[PDB]
Tab-separated table of C-alpha atoms and ligand atoms in Angstrom:
chain	number	residue	atom	x	y	z
L	61	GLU	CA	144.293	101.841	195.423
L	62	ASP	CA	144.140	104.954	193.213
L	63	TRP	CA	147.010	106.129	191.002
L	64	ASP	CA	148.713	109.415	190.076
L	65	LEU	CA	149.350	110.297	186.411
L	66	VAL	CA	153.031	111.294	186.180
L	67	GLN	CA	153.995	111.562	182.488
L	68	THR	CA	152.804	110.788	178.942
L	69	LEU	CA	154.429	107.713	177.370
L	70	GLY	CA	152.718	108.249	173.999
L	71	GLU	CA	149.538	109.615	172.398
L	72	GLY	CA	148.263	106.687	170.311
L	73	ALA	CA	145.329	107.685	168.073
L	74	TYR	CA	142.204	107.028	170.222
L	75	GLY	CA	143.771	108.918	173.140
L	76	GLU	CA	146.917	108.679	175.271
L	77	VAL	CA	148.922	106.376	177.544
L	78	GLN	CA	150.402	107.539	180.863
L	79	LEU	CA	152.892	106.169	183.405
L	80	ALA	CA	150.625	105.952	186.466
L	81	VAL	CA	152.775	105.526	189.592
L	82	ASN	CA	151.146	105.029	192.992
L	83	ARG	CA	152.826	107.245	195.615
L	84	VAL	CA	152.666	104.619	198.407
L	85	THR	CA	153.864	101.273	196.994
L	86	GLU	CA	155.550	102.802	193.907
L	87	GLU	CA	154.006	100.154	191.631
L	88	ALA	CA	154.291	101.354	188.017
L	89	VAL	CA	151.506	100.593	185.512
L	90	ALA	CA	150.618	101.977	182.061
L	91	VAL	CA	147.166	103.543	181.596
L	92	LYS	CA	145.403	103.676	178.219
L	93	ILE	CA	142.769	106.436	178.034
L	94	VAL	CA	140.005	106.112	175.425
L	95	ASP	CA	137.196	108.660	174.978
L	96	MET	CA	133.855	106.873	174.506
L	97	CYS	CA	130.286	103.464	169.284
L	98	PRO	CA	131.830	101.905	172.436
L	99	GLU	CA	131.895	98.300	171.090
L	100	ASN	CA	135.627	98.647	170.323
L	101	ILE	CA	136.684	99.300	173.938
L	102	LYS	CA	134.212	96.964	175.699
L	103	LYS	CA	135.370	94.041	173.540
L	104	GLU	CA	138.997	94.984	174.280
L	105	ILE	CA	138.341	94.759	178.043
L	106	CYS	CA	136.665	91.334	177.869
L	107	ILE	CA	139.477	89.815	175.789
L	108	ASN	CA	142.053	91.383	178.141
L	109	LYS	CA	140.445	89.646	181.145
L	110	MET	CA	140.922	86.243	179.455
L	111	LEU	CA	144.664	86.798	178.959
L	112	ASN	CA	147.424	85.498	181.235
L	113	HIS	CA	150.860	84.847	179.727
L	114	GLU	CA	154.504	85.941	180.098
L	115	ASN	CA	154.590	87.332	176.512
L	116	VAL	CA	151.292	89.244	176.705
L	117	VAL	CA	150.712	92.637	178.348
L	118	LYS	CA	148.909	91.903	181.635
L	119	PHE	CA	145.512	93.456	182.390
L	120	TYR	CA	145.047	94.507	186.020
L	121	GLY	CA	141.688	96.298	185.905
L	122	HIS	CA	139.535	99.162	184.625
L	123	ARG	CA	137.420	102.168	185.654
L	124	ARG	CA	134.391	103.704	183.882
L	125	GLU	CA	134.910	107.034	185.711
L	126	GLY	CA	131.922	108.707	184.040
L	127	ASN	CA	132.868	108.979	180.354
L	128	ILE	CA	136.654	108.408	180.402
L	129	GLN	CA	137.624	104.708	180.401
L	130	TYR	CA	140.943	103.781	182.048
L	131	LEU	CA	142.528	100.449	181.087
L	132	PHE	CA	145.237	99.604	183.631
L	133	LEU	CA	147.993	97.476	182.079
L	134	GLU	CA	151.518	96.101	182.533
L	135	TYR	CA	154.188	98.798	182.228
L	136	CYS	CA	156.885	98.080	179.640
L	137	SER	CA	159.867	100.414	180.148
L	138	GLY	CA	161.713	99.118	177.058
L	139	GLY	CA	159.258	100.700	174.612
L	140	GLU	CA	158.328	99.419	171.150
L	141	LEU	CA	160.166	96.791	169.107
L	142	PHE	CA	159.880	99.315	166.257
L	143	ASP	CA	162.605	101.442	167.891
L	144	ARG	CA	165.063	98.521	168.197
L	145	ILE	CA	165.008	98.157	164.379
L	146	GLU	CA	167.622	100.397	162.733
L	147	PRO	CA	166.391	101.494	159.266
L	148	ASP	CA	167.979	99.606	156.331
L	149	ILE	CA	169.981	97.268	158.636
L	150	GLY	CA	167.583	95.557	161.056
L	151	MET	CA	169.225	94.041	164.135
L	152	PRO	CA	171.708	91.263	165.023
L	153	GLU	CA	170.376	87.854	163.966
L	154	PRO	CA	170.575	86.389	167.516
L	155	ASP	CA	168.421	89.254	168.879
L	156	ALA	CA	165.857	88.787	166.083
L	157	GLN	CA	165.615	85.050	166.787
L	158	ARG	CA	165.011	85.556	170.521
L	159	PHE	CA	162.259	88.126	169.878
L	160	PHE	CA	160.746	85.735	167.316
L	161	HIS	CA	160.792	82.854	169.844
L	162	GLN	CA	158.928	85.046	172.328
L	163	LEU	CA	156.508	86.304	169.662
L	164	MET	CA	155.658	82.709	168.690
L	165	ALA	CA	155.185	81.762	172.364
L	166	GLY	CA	152.676	84.594	172.810
L	167	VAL	CA	150.864	83.933	169.524
L	168	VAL	CA	150.679	80.197	170.391
L	169	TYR	CA	149.042	81.184	173.682
L	170	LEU	CA	146.441	83.456	172.058
L	171	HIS	CA	145.554	80.954	169.336
L	172	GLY	CA	145.246	78.240	172.000
L	173	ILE	CA	142.518	80.134	173.875
L	174	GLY	CA	140.780	80.995	170.593
L	175	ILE	CA	141.894	84.639	170.245
L	176	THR	CA	143.462	86.278	167.185
L	177	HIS	CA	145.297	89.608	167.588
L	178	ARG	CA	144.744	90.762	163.952
L	179	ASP	CA	147.325	93.598	163.958
L	180	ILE	CA	150.741	92.193	164.879
L	181	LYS	CA	153.518	94.657	164.050
L	182	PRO	CA	156.679	96.070	165.734
L	183	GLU	CA	154.646	99.028	167.077
L	184	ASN	CA	152.322	96.671	169.015
L	185	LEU	CA	155.182	94.527	170.369
L	186	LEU	CA	156.496	96.058	173.594
L	187	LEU	CA	159.649	95.347	175.597
L	188	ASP	CA	159.817	95.093	179.394
L	189	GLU	CA	162.870	95.904	181.571
L	190	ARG	CA	164.790	92.686	180.732
L	191	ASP	CA	163.949	92.972	176.994
L	192	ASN	CA	161.175	90.340	177.012
L	193	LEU	CA	158.648	90.797	174.203
L	194	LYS	CA	154.979	91.315	175.063
L	195	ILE	CA	152.085	91.471	172.582
L	196	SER	CA	149.897	94.547	173.171
L	197	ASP	CA	146.750	96.346	171.948
L	198	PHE	CA	143.805	93.935	171.666
L	199	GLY	CA	141.396	96.599	170.391
L	200	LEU	CA	141.257	94.839	167.017
L	201	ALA	CA	141.375	91.316	168.515
L	202	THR	CA	138.463	88.859	168.284
L	203	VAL	CA	137.381	85.299	169.113
L	204	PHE	CA	137.926	82.848	166.242
L	205	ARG	CA	137.259	79.708	168.322
L	206	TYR	CA	134.529	79.089	170.905
L	207	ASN	CA	133.344	75.738	172.320
L	208	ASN	CA	135.944	74.009	170.091
L	209	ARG	CA	134.362	75.358	166.890
L	210	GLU	CA	136.303	77.593	164.499
L	211	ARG	CA	134.604	80.560	162.847
L	212	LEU	CA	135.899	82.322	159.733
L	213	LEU	CA	136.624	86.053	159.707
L	214	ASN	CA	135.081	88.511	157.223
L	215	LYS	CA	136.240	91.879	158.580
L	216	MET	CA	139.217	93.413	156.795
L	217	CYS	CA	141.487	94.982	159.412
L	218	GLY	CA	145.079	95.431	160.556
L	219	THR	CA	147.839	97.238	158.665
L	220	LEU	CA	148.463	96.938	154.905
L	221	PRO	CA	152.229	96.120	154.898
L	222	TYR	CA	151.634	93.372	157.513
L	223	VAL	CA	148.290	92.062	156.206
L	224	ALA	CA	147.959	88.639	154.526
L	225	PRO	CA	146.903	88.529	150.850
L	226	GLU	CA	143.795	86.378	151.502
L	227	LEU	CA	141.954	89.084	153.474
L	228	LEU	CA	142.182	91.386	150.430
L	229	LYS	CA	141.214	88.629	147.942
L	230	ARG	CA	138.596	86.504	149.767
L	231	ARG	CA	135.240	87.172	151.434
L	232	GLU	CA	136.055	84.770	154.292
L	233	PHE	CA	139.324	83.343	155.621
L	234	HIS	CA	140.977	81.479	158.515
L	235	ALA	CA	142.327	83.619	161.373
L	236	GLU	CA	145.511	81.754	162.335
L	237	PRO	CA	147.318	81.908	158.945
L	238	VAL	CA	146.794	85.705	158.948
L	239	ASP	CA	148.636	86.052	162.286
L	240	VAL	CA	151.446	83.793	160.982
L	241	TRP	CA	151.853	85.938	157.847
L	242	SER	CA	152.250	89.163	159.870
L	243	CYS	CA	154.801	87.492	162.183
L	244	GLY	CA	156.754	86.734	158.996
L	245	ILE	CA	156.632	90.393	157.938
L	246	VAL	CA	157.873	91.348	161.435
L	247	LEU	CA	160.766	88.864	161.026
L	248	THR	CA	161.650	90.414	157.661
L	249	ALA	CA	161.694	93.882	159.249
L	250	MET	CA	163.920	92.698	162.116
L	251	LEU	CA	166.454	91.114	159.709
L	252	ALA	CA	166.487	93.806	156.960
L	253	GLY	CA	165.326	97.103	158.494
L	254	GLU	CA	162.622	97.547	155.845
L	255	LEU	CA	159.200	96.221	154.813
L	256	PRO	CA	159.086	94.204	151.558
L	257	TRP	CA	155.901	95.832	150.140
L	258	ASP	CA	153.060	98.315	150.726
L	259	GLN	CA	150.536	95.505	150.278
L	260	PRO	CA	150.459	91.881	149.052
L	261	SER	CA	148.462	92.544	145.862
L	262	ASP	CA	149.131	91.665	142.214
L	263	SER	CA	149.142	95.443	141.544
L	264	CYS	CA	152.298	95.732	143.685
L	265	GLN	CA	155.605	95.221	141.858
L	266	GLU	CA	157.546	94.253	144.990
L	267	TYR	CA	155.080	91.493	145.900
L	268	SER	CA	155.143	90.091	142.336
L	269	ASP	CA	158.952	89.944	142.475
L	270	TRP	CA	158.763	87.849	145.661
L	271	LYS	CA	156.328	85.357	144.075
L	272	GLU	CA	158.756	85.027	141.132
L	273	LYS	CA	161.522	84.101	143.646
L	274	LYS	CA	163.701	87.115	142.796
L	275	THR	CA	165.588	87.089	146.112
L	276	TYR	CA	168.540	89.036	144.652
L	277	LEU	CA	166.594	92.267	145.326
L	278	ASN	CA	166.090	94.098	148.635
L	279	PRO	CA	165.130	93.316	151.271
L	280	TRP	CA	165.806	89.586	150.701
L	281	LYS	CA	169.484	90.049	149.755
L	282	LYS	CA	170.296	91.306	153.297
L	283	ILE	CA	168.838	88.312	155.153
L	284	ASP	CA	170.819	84.979	154.891
L	285	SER	CA	169.819	81.573	153.526
L	286	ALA	CA	168.613	80.027	156.823
L	287	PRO	CA	166.039	82.670	157.943
L	288	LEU	CA	165.160	83.356	154.270
L	289	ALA	CA	164.135	79.704	153.875
L	290	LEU	CA	161.763	80.114	156.833
L	291	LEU	CA	160.414	83.286	155.198
L	292	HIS	CA	159.804	81.228	152.032
L	293	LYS	CA	157.523	78.964	154.104
L	294	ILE	CA	155.626	81.762	155.907
L	295	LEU	CA	154.981	84.191	153.049
L	296	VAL	CA	153.217	81.647	150.812
L	297	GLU	CA	150.228	83.206	149.012
L	298	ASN	CA	147.832	80.296	149.607
L	299	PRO	CA	146.981	80.067	153.343
L	300	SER	CA	146.411	76.264	153.095
L	301	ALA	CA	149.953	75.670	151.787
L	302	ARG	CA	151.302	78.176	154.336
L	303	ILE	CA	153.346	76.888	157.282
L	304	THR	CA	151.693	76.543	160.704
L	305	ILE	CA	153.225	77.433	164.070
L	306	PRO	CA	153.907	73.795	165.119
L	307	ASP	CA	155.988	73.421	161.913
L	308	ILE	CA	157.761	76.775	162.511
L	309	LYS	CA	159.097	75.312	165.790
L	310	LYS	CA	160.709	72.496	163.748
L	311	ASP	CA	162.379	74.880	161.262
L	312	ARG	CA	166.191	74.871	160.953
L	313	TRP	CA	166.796	78.581	161.653
L	314	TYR	CA	164.237	78.575	164.487
L	315	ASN	CA	166.329	75.886	166.229
L	316	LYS	CA	169.771	77.257	165.235
L	317	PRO	CA	172.021	78.136	168.218
L	318	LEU	CA	172.956	81.830	167.932
L	319	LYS	CA	172.607	83.823	171.175
L	320	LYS	CA	174.369	83.465	174.534
L	321	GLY	CA	172.798	83.578	178.011
L	322	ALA	CA	172.030	86.460	180.376
L	323	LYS	CA	174.580	89.256	180.833
H	257	DFZ	O1	149.329	98.094	176.070
H	257	DFZ	C1	149.598	98.995	174.984
H	257	DFZ	C2	149.529	100.445	175.483
H	257	DFZ	N1	150.884	101.022	175.545
H	257	DFZ	C3	151.764	100.640	176.475
H	257	DFZ	N2	151.382	99.683	177.341
H	257	DFZ	C4	152.188	99.236	178.286
H	257	DFZ	N3	153.407	99.720	178.428
H	257	DFZ	C5	153.862	100.679	177.613
H	257	DFZ	N4	155.039	101.290	177.583
H	257	DFZ	C6	155.072	102.185	176.601
H	257	DFZ	C7	156.175	102.995	176.303
H	257	DFZ	C8	157.395	102.711	176.917
H	257	DFZ	C9	158.531	103.479	176.665
H	257	DFZ	C10	158.459	104.551	175.783
H	257	DFZ	C11	157.247	104.843	175.162
H	257	DFZ	C12	156.116	104.071	175.422
H	257	DFZ	C13	153.832	102.139	175.949
H	257	DFZ	C14	153.415	102.912	174.862
H	257	DFZ	C15	152.489	103.937	175.068
H	257	DFZ	C16	152.045	104.722	174.006
H	257	DFZ	C17	152.532	104.488	172.722
H	257	DFZ	C18	153.457	103.465	172.512
H	257	DFZ	C19	153.897	102.676	173.577
H	257	DFZ	C20	153.054	101.176	176.596
């Protein structure tokens, strides 16, 4: 089945994404369009074929079509999580907890099959029709485990506000703690409506304030003791002392009843 390109959802750097609706079955699917150094897109396709989870953007197929590559993907009519975050306020705590539960479920899945996303942020977290979170954009993703053997990462990538301090300070570093750190920055953004720092370096005043436990300053003063205590465990400088995902599922705020059922 071939598809018709109706509208443009959003032009994201490398090219554009379009709402491709078939005119027979009316099945809606997003379509990333990248103009082909084609090791970035060919790696993205292989990793996408491995994926199969409720909190990850599904990959249906692809088409070389001469020079223009067409990644067919799951359509998410809700848009980005970025746009559900009101500046300076964040969102209701119950909403933030549900999105965090779904984010952890998706990140647990990826880490279980040996994949790290490497650029988790509200802009890459899409929402479907019933507001379920789905991790998207695996163009920076890579294998950190193969045949039950971990491999350290050496490539610096991602986004500076969301990036863990060890990838700026160390030549090599574990992949999983980096993903956990960025999930913690996403949580901060959901509960405060702002990012805590430009980068986690010692040459950044805001980061140094956080290490000195000065939680009377923004954004920490907007949060609340329960989720803040979880943030104290995630945003630990040393990745070996940093909390893991199994232990995040045992956290008090993570298991606090807050939100009601379906409407
Ligand atoms: O898989 C990541 C590719 N992008 C997408 N994939 C799958 N479903 C999607 N819905 C969207 C989208 C939905 C509502 C409004 C705007 C965009 C987008 C979107 C496309 C470009 C930029 C940002 C978001 C999208």
